[PDB]
């Protein structure tokens, strides 16, 4: 008298992090299959016949389904590996769909209220069971042939279907109604305790044979890895093992010397800490490569107007991290061309210590049509809702809309997508922060895009001789005599020059012979002069 395996326990299941979801799934889908049959039959109830698991990809959805399958005293589970049923001839997909349920019907007709459970695991239910609408080809027929089997004129009572998908809203609505796939669970990214348990599960075996050094710690690794997804944790452990093993392929077995040195192999903290920086790069985490590409030549301090901007950025970050009545915040950086607004946004973003940071620039969308840009922006904004903190940077706003002064001309659709997105708070609890960057504030003011933003900041140019001299001194060019001559010539008047244009005039002037350098630099600076 048992429907479950006589011997089992959860601690052997190999799953770690998903505790409450498993408890709820058991309560719903297994409460009425483990009570004594007499009471259940007296009640006159019917068992649940569906489960739908959805969430971010790579967090252990397939594993839970396979382990629920290998759980029971049920026969071995069948599998429909996604698009394995499609065919070219007329009326062949339906044969494939109908072939699955044959054994269940046979047993139900042969026995009654006594047969053994049958489990069908359906991978990527989204691939085929799309909305039933125009024609879609084979989609409309397969969906009907499926909906007409789980609950039809004839009654089945010994079946249970599991459906896995990462996008939940593209499944036909009818399918997801009480009576067919009913209980739907979400598996998300794990927090600290989940990472601790996963690392223990994946390191126990090494620990068993003493192969693990005493220097390594697991709590520190759990703390330092944030927004890692399980698969990435396994990858990290494998990378550590491979690095440790390769540490010996050049010392002991390379020279074919006594393996005792090779047999003293032991993975240590060095392997992990040197493998956390050059092998694994999360998909929902900070990526320390772009910031080294945007702030090309550092952030020098040419005067006051840098400190104020940085302080304001810090204040905005601090506000967005510790407030409950204001989850969504925004800010706009603006100024004249060639002033530095993509090298002061990156710094503010990178000095926040948020677990998620992303930059969406127009440089990686050359040739795209409008809908491609819309779906790129929406995809980047989808991720930030799946982490408990974030910062998304929108760079060069005026090149996204495809602006051009003649006309004027621009893309309406991108503007509407942007205006709707700048006023959408994330699901309950989470936070956000958005930074912009533009050079034509007024044209933005015309389109009514300064109502969405909650503040603005101003980045100025070099506007006095002293600041130019300080910038030249810090950059490290020209000598004492040349410095003195430049100071005496340029002190009287005033200058108005950006800070990404000075780095070009310096180079253009540093290409003549030593005698004419200062003269050419002064001529170039004078010619490229103007006033507000």
């Amino acid at each position: 008298q048992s429907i479950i395996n006589p011997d089992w326990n959860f601690e052997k299941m190999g799953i770690g992090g998903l505790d409450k979801e498993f408890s709820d799934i058991f309560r719903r889908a297994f409460a009425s299959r483990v009570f004594p049959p007499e009471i259940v039959e007296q009640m006159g109830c019917k068992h649940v016949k569906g489960i739908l698991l959805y969430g971010p990809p790579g967090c252990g959805k397939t594993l839970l389904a396979r382990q629920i399958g290998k759980m029971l005293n049920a026969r071995e589970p069948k599998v429909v590996n996604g698009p394995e049923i499609l065919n070219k001839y007329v009326g062949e997909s339906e044969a494939n769909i109908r072939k699955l349920f044959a054994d269940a019907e046979e047993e139900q007709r042969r026995l009654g209220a006594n047969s053994g459970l049958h489990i069908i695991i359906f991978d990527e239910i989204d691939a085929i069971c799309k909305q039933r609408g125009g024609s879609t080809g084979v989609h409309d027929t397969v969906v009907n042939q499926l909906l007409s089997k789980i609950d039809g004129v004839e009654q089945l009572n010994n079946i249970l279907v599991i459906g896995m998908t990462n996008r939940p809203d593209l499944i036909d609505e009818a399918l997801l109604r009480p009576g067919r796939l009913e209980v739907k669970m979400e598996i998300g990214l794990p927090d600290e305790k989940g990472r601790l348990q996963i690392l223990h599960i994946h390191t126990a075996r090494m620990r068993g044979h003493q192969l693990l050094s005493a220097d390594v710690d697991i709590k520190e690794l759990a703390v330092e890895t944030k927004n890692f997804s399980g698969a990435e944790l396994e990858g990290l452990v494998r990378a550590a093992q491979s690095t440790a093993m390769n540490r010996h392929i050049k010392a002991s077995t390379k020279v074919e010397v006594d393996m005792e040195k090779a047999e003293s192999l032991q993975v240590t903290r060095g392997d992990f800490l040197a493998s956390l920086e050059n092998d694994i790069k999360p998909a929902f985490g900070t990526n320390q490569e772009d910031y080294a590409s945007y702030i090309m030549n550092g952030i020098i301090k040419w005067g006051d107007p840098v400190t104020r901007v940085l302080d304001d950025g810090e204040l905005l970050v601090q506000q967005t991290k510790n407030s409950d009545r204001t989850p969504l915040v925004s800010v706009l950086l603006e100024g004249p061309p060639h002033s530095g607004k993509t090298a002061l946004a990156a710094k503010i973003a990178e000095e926040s210590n948020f677990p998620f940071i992303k930059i969406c620039s127009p440089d990686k969308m050359i040739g795209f049509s409008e809908t491609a840009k819309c779906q790129a922006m929406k995809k980047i904004f989808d991720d930030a809702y799946k982490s408990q903190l974030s910062c998304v940077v929108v760079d060069d706003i005026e090149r996204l809309l495809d602006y051009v002064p003649i006309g004027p001309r621009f893309s309406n659709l991108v503007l509407q997508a942007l205006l709707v997105l700048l006023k959408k708070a994330p699901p309950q609890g989470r936070k956000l922060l958005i930074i912009g960057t533009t050079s034509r504030k007024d044209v933005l003011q015309e389109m009514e895009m300064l109502n969405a933003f909650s503040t603005t900041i101003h980045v100025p140019n070099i506007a006095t001789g002293e600041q130019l001299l300080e910038a030249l001194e810090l950059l490290g060019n020209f000598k004492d005599k040349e410095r003195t001559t430049i100071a005496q010539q340029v002190k009287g008047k005033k200058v108005w020059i950006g800070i990404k244009k000075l780095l070009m005039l310096i180079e253009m002037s540093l290409q003549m012979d030593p005698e004419y350098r200062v003269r050419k630099f002064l001529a170039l600076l004078r010619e490229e002069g103007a006033s507000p």
């Binding site: 070219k88 001839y89 007329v90 080809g137 084979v138």
Partner: peptide, 29 residues
């Protein structure tokens, strides 16, 4: 639109029989 499906037809080969029975039965008799 790309989804183009097809129907099909079949043939046979056939063999010889009808009077071999008579010869076999006559031999046995």
């Amino acid at each position: 639109s790309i989804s183009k499906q097809a129907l099909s037809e079949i043939e046979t080969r056939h063999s010889e029989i009808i009077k071999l029975e008579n010869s076999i039965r006559e031999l046995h008799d």
